[PDB]
Amino acid sequence: GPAYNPEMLKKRQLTVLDLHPGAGKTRRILPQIIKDAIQKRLRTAVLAPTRVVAAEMAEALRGLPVRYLTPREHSGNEIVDVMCHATLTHRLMSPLRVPNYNLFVMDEAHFTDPASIAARGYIATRVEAGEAAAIFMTATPPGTSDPFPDTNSPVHDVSSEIPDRAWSSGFEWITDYAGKTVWFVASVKMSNEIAQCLQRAGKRVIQLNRKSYDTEYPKCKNGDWDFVITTDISEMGANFGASRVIDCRKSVKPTILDEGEGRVILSVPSAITSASAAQRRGRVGRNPSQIGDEYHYGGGTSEDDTMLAHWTEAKILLDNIHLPNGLVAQLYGPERDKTYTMDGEYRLRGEERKTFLELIKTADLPVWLAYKVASNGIQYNDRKWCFDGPRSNIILEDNNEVEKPRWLDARVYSDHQSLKWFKDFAAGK
């Protein structure tokens, strides 16, 4: 759409800026937005998808009075705050006072993390009510349908069969490749299997996922790698010095079955959206001086993601954000129809909401599972629910078992990193 203009900072304005690699979002557009906001004395929240991007913003906004609310001194007089999407949501769910932001600027606003969706709903609600302006920045705005957008440098788009598991023959084109490859896989479990196969083939491999990103992504800069094997987390602003993307064009989707008690299952890998495909491809084609970038895609796209648990989880989060003067939160317009129940259905009382926030924010439990635990009067430190569940809920590692739980969320035991964490949570830590 149109280019950033100060009109966009006025109350009731919500603008999606379709801003692409190259010129000049973090180092030129964002700084100008913030300069204009300060000039108009607007109380501003700048929202990054990840701590990594929040640090990059800090670099870009040097010389402006900006407070960084992510883990470092401040005057206490700054009116621009930089944080993660989830930090805003998490703050809004606590009784601690949230400033009356006049302007929200959300980077990588396509992020479908539940707390990102919830943030957008809160923001859109405040804007619609005339209390704020919002700018959402993304290369894939609502209604994106093109998996193959124009780029800064040409990309060779190639339909290719992509392994979903280890292989012992064939796929020579994968391993013969002399440059750097970013390979989007459907899951962490797939990541581990693909990565180990490539390592046995002598390749230097970095694995990026939600958990590993903060520590592992900074290692990419050094160039000491052949493959980055990544989940969808790299769709939120990752910049690789790569010449090839491999994209299985799939993702495992969590889904809530409900279904007596409820559980969350992980779908078999299924087609991603056209917007997601464009974001995966968009890791390459960025540098006009680098020709011959390749994008290999292993399947089609599908726009129906209404079964994603994140949509319900977003409104569980949103039902637990107290709004000043009678305002009832709805999801951001383009995201409203994905699901919907009775408004306020997931709203919790004080002590339960506090337990809920701590389960999600400190224990890193999925929002649904944290909600199940909190909604049943369980105290944060009371792990008894992890052991006194039905028989069917026994958890197995290599079909064992190991040492439950009252409720099953497949996201806590479907890979090595996650099960290792959930077992520790069962303690402990």
138 annotated as a binding-site residue: no
Resolution for this model in angstroms, one decimal place? 1.9
Q: Which residue in this structure is represented by tokens 């993390």? A: 113
Q: Which residue in this structure is represented by tokens 């704020």? A: 132
Same domain, 44 and 123: yes
Same domain, 324 and 380: no
Same domain, 239 and 299: yes
Residue 311's CB is within 10 A of a number of other CB atoms, namely 21
d(CA 68, CA 237): 19
Beta-carbon contacts of 260 under 8 Å, excluding residues fewer than 6 positions away, are: none
Same domain, 120 and 27: yes
Residue 236, burial from CB neighbour count under 10 angstroms (0-12, 13-18, 19+): buried
Q: What are phi and psi of 292, to 5 degrees?
A: 90, 10
19 annotated as a binding-site residue: yes
Q: What is the DSSP string of 356-372?
A: HHHHHHTS---HHHHHH
Q: What is the CA radius of gyration of the chain?
A: 22
Same domain, 264 and 399: yes
Same domain, 315 and 358: no
Residue among 312, 304, 301 nearest 255 (CA): 312
DSSP 374: H
d(CA 56, CA 71): 13
Residue among 263, 266, 231, 269 nearest 250 (CA): 269
215 annotated as a binding-site residue: no
316, 342, 368: which is the final residue of a domain? 342
410 annotated as a binding-site residue: no
- What's the CATH code of the domain at 3? 3.40.50.300
25 annotated as a binding-site residue: yes
Helix/strand/coil for 205: strand
Total domains in the chain come to 3
20 annotated as a binding-site residue: yes
d(CA 216, CA 214): 6
Residue 216, burial from CB neighbour count under 10 angstroms (0-12, 13-18, 19+): middle
| Strand pairing report for 244-247 and 293-297 | parallel
Same domain, 169 and 64: no
Q: How was this structure determined?
A: X-ray
Token code pair at residue 16: 């999606």
Same domain, 103 and 151: no
> Can you give the residue range of the structural domain that contains 353?
252-268+343-429
Same domain, 262 and 394: yes
d(CA 173, CA 108): 32
Same domain, 190 and 172: yes
Same domain, 275 and 195: yes
Beta-carbon contacts of 176 under 8 Å, excluding residues fewer than 6 positions away, are: none
d(CA 127, CA 360): 27
Residue among 373, 349, 344, 345 nearest 359 (CA): 373
Cβ distance 169 to 197 under 8 Å? Answer: no
Same domain, 153 and 261: no
